């Protein structure tokens, strides 16, 4: 009675393998991982059983495998005993007799096509699966990964990789068959209440935890994102705020995103991304007019400079859409007195865009790459203060491009999936007009809260088991920041769950 | 053959345990967690065994502890059979009968005195420690615990808790006799290599991590500071700096602490509190004069006000210990023209200090009580850039009064014991001044790195077990927050590891 499990690389959605006798794509880092989980042993006098089907065999060009035993379930291949490490048998429950003798097999796996992963599964013969979700799907199978049963639970599942722009994972699925440290911490958080700092950040319950099941393996750094909403709802506290929709917040918080292997847009629902992308270009061009933002068909500062809602916070001789200086306008001219948002600033206050990136490049090792909009003169001359307040920018030794925001304030329902994607896009525009590779991305929010009419549509989100980042690739080499466009932009395996509708509050 | 636990209550450094038969200090939750520890059992028809001297029984009025059993250890009490929750026995190695029979008896815990303790532990009978380190030293005990056999490990240490001024911890001490996850995982990163981003936050090695036996008890948030300490040693890249001393960096790392039941103190050196306190009266009161500093015997500064060091980063023309516009110049008067530390500034300049405390008690649950000390204007001004760069202060719905740093440069060994203490400081003050208590603490760092020359002190300061949080309090409460000496702060219960010296980086 040894282990047996699968090994498979399916399509993210509808799970294909295979077409025309051969794999849909060639990962090569998926067949190191394919050879390491395989040749994973504990004795060293002893080998593991490779179980695959005929034309799986013809695959591999009916070649062995070093140091490992191929068994090739067949009905007219013949029973050759001339290879040692090649063994034919007849059927597949026949060929489990590596279980009932053969003390020199330690693990099992179950390597085949469609055709053995079906009945090793009906069989009830699967302990473990070891699945490798590719981001492809708009291309042609013809053999498919059977769905996986309700028996089995993820237990892990890894980060995004990629390879040749495609993106991929890794998930182990496991079928569902020190006490005296967590006694005391409980027995101690009986006795004093809030007064010992863990009870004010409970862990958050199952029924609103992600994947639930994956306990200690939430590679993702989509969990990052996922983790938090499960915060809130576990400790927020409900409070009222300036909009008449109060929230639950919590205070001090943090998130990890790789940007080297894959791009953190979150994929448990669709975020649009063109949207990220326009606001992120009008704040580098220095832009405060918030037409040029609804003449592109984006709406996301209507709200916010609307002439009611102007007039009801002080600024009622401002026009329809002047935002005043904001974002963009204490980036590029910083500490300029401002007008309207019609007047020319070319050489006006300090342009940190431009000297950050000339610090980039002239010193990279330099502690001080710092973008700021948190300008307490113009405070009162803005439609919004910043939410996004200052942002770090770090290069590493292999000349990577990392970067930290601090956020004062965070709607995590729908301003946190637009500031992943906006400050992960800006990292890598300073990246390619710097000659360096995009890095990782930190976010440190002061206050994490949720809008209270977002509450189902939220726990709708958690419900949805995440999927591989996508890729972003430039299609061009711009010379200066402020030439990219959003036709320079391509987004390459982004495979989302249905969009989510959450009304702004304003 | 079952369990045998001590519980004890000592003192911090000698371990002292009582004084003319009774304990030396009355902690109620104390009393809560022998109780709570004691009773916790799994068999509704089984108790658990108390053994303790004569002297102890004599300590607790000779009475029955509810729903236990009390086993006196004495040479002259009667054997008496009237009561059934009290049985005698004549020497402590008889009394471990509960092992070999009386099947009613789920635990054994060890509650008695000196004599009980020390012979408990000399003949091998202890499996567990429960400790709970009291800070109170400069008194009187007669009594005392033994120390604890090099057998024994830590497990669990908990957070700094608060009794009427007194701190203390709670300690687990244990003796010394999934899997596919892991390998998995491993495989992962030998198959990629500083792509998997794991890869580049490796878990520091056992030799550079502060008591390493506590792995899932590692409560104490001074583990916050020395874990970090441990990620800069496994992960840090030689980098070179404006500085002729090279520093082992990571970038985006946080810490937490708590300051409603302690204040976070570090316990592992010996940290200048008065230097702290000087320096911070020293921002809040809008001053850059360096001398002031100097006058008070506060020399942090003299490095980067020196004549060879100003005429260096070109600012020759600037008085000695002219700082120019640096912290409390910005918090006090931000965007004001800075013309030396001589002149008159009031008036001049936004003063977010006062802005921030009005807007605490006028609008609590307002998400935008931010103090900054950047300045893009006025950073070429500066004797040196500000390295806590941005705060951001938040009202919990039971008034209490929590802070966020973000920190753009952080120097481990010298700037990073002090940032911890000054804004935990800063936050205490907002907090009389505005009429709330302590919160929480949280700093997001940027560059966190350890200085060459820091290696061998902080690798010393790596091997000493943190000792709990002192305490911090006002003697009386100001008017105005410009108006704390040094003489209003009483700093109860701190008893520190020696000094550890460490030069600064000009
Ligand atoms: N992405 C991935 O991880 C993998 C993909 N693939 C791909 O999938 C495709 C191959 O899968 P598939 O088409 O299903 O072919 P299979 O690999 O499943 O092989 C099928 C053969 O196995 C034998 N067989 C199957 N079931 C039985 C049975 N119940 N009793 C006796 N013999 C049996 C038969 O051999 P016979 O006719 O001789 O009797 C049958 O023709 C290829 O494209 C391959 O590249 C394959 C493995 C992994
Ligand atoms: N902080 C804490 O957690 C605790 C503190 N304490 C404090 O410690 C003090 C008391 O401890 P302590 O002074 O050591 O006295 P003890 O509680 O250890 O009691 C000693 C008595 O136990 C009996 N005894 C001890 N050893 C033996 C033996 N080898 N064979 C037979 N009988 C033995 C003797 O009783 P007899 O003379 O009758 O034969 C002896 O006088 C008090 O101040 C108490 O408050 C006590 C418990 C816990
Ligand atoms: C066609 N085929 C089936 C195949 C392909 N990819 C998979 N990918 C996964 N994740 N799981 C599988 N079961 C799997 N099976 C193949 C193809 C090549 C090798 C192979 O050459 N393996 C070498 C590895 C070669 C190398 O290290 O790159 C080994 O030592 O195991 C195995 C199976
Ligand atoms: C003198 N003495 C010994 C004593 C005192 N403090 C300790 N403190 C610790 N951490 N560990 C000990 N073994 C310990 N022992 C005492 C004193 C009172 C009680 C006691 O009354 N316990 C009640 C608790 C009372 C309450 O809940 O406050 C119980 O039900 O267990 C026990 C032991
Ligand atoms: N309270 C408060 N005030 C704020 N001021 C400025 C912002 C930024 C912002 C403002 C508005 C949005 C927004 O509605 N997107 C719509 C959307 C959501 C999900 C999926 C797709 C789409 C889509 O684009 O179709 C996003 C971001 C902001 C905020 O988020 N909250
Ligand atoms: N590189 C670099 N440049 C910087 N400029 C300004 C600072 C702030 C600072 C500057 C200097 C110190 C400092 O030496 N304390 C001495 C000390 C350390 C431990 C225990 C006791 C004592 C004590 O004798 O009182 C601390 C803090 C700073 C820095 O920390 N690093
Ligand atoms: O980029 C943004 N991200 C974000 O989360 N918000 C949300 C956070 C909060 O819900 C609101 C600001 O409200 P307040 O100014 O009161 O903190 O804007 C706004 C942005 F522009
Ligand atoms: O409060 C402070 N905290 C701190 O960490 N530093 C250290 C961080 C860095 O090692 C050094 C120089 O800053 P920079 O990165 O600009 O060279 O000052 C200085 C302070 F004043």
């Not at 990577?400 to 965070?410: A, D, F, G, K, P």
């Not at 949720?450 to 189902?456: A, M, R, S, V």
């Amino acid at each position: 009675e040894k282990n047996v499990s699968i090994v498979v690389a399916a399509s993210v959605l509808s799970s294909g393998i295979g077409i025309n006798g051969q794999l849909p794509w060639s990962i090569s880092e998926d067949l190191k991982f394919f050879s390491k989980i395989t040749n994973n042993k504990c004795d060293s006098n002893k080998k593991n059983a490779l179980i695959m089907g005929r034309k799986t065999w013809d695959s591999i060009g009916r070649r062995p495998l070093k140091n490992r035993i191929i068994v090739v379930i067949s009905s007219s291949l013949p029973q050759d005993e001339a290879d040692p490490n090649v063994v034919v048998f007849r059927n597949l429950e026949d060929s489990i007799e590596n279980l009932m003798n053969d003390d020199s097999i330690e693990n099992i796996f179950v390597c085949g096509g469609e055709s053995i992963y079906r009945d090793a599964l009906k069989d009830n013969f699967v302990d473990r699966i070891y699945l490798t979700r590719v981001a492809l799907e708009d291309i042609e199978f013809d053999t498919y990964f059977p769905e996986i049963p309700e028996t089995f639970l993820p237990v892990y599942m890894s980060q995004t990789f990629c390879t040749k722009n495609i993106s991929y994972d890794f998930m182990i699925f496991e079928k569902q068959e020190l006490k005296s440290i967590d006694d005391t911490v409980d027995l101690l958080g009986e006795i004093f209440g809030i007064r010992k700092m863990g009870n004010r950040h409970k862990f958050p319950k199952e029924e609103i935890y992600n994947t639930p099941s994956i306990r200690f393996g939430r590679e993702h750094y989509e969990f990052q994102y996922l983790d938090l909403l499960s915060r809130v709802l576990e400790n927020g506290a409900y409070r009222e705020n300036r909009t008449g929709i109060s929230t639950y917040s919590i205070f001090g918080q943090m998130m990890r995103f790789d940007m080297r292997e894959s791009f953190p847009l979150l994929t448990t629902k669709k975020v649009a991304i063109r949207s990220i992308f326009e606001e992120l270009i009008w704040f580098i061009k220095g832009d405060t007019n918030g037409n040029h933002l609804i003449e592109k068909k984006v709406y996301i500062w209507s709200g916010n400079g609307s002439k009611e809602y102007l007039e009801r916070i002080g600024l009622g001789h401002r026009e329809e859409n002047d935002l005043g200086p904001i974002y963009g306008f204490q980036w590029r001219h910083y500490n300029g007195e401002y007008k309207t948002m019609h007047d020319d600033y070319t050489g006006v206050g300090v342009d940190q865009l431009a000297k950050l990136i000339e610090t980039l490049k002239n010193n990279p090792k330099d502690r001080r790459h710092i973008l700021t909009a948190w300008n307490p003169s113009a405070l009162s001359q803005m439609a919004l203060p910043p939410c996004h307040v200052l942002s770090q920018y770090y290069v590493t030794n292999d000349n990577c491009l990392s970067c930290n925001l601090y956020q004062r304030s965070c709607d995590l329902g729908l301003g946190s999936p637009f500031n992943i994607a906006s400050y992960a896009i800006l990292t890598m525009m300073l990246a390619q007009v710097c000659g360096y590779e995009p890095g990782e991305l930190a976010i440190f929010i002061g206050d994490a809260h949720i809008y209270e009419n977002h509450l189902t549509q939220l726990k709708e989100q958690l419900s949805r088991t995440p999927r591989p980042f996508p890729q972003l690739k430039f299609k061009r080499k711009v010379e200066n920041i402020e030439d990219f466009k959003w036709e320079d932009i391509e987004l390459i395996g982004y495979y989302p769950y249905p969009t989510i509708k959450m009304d702004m509050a304003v």
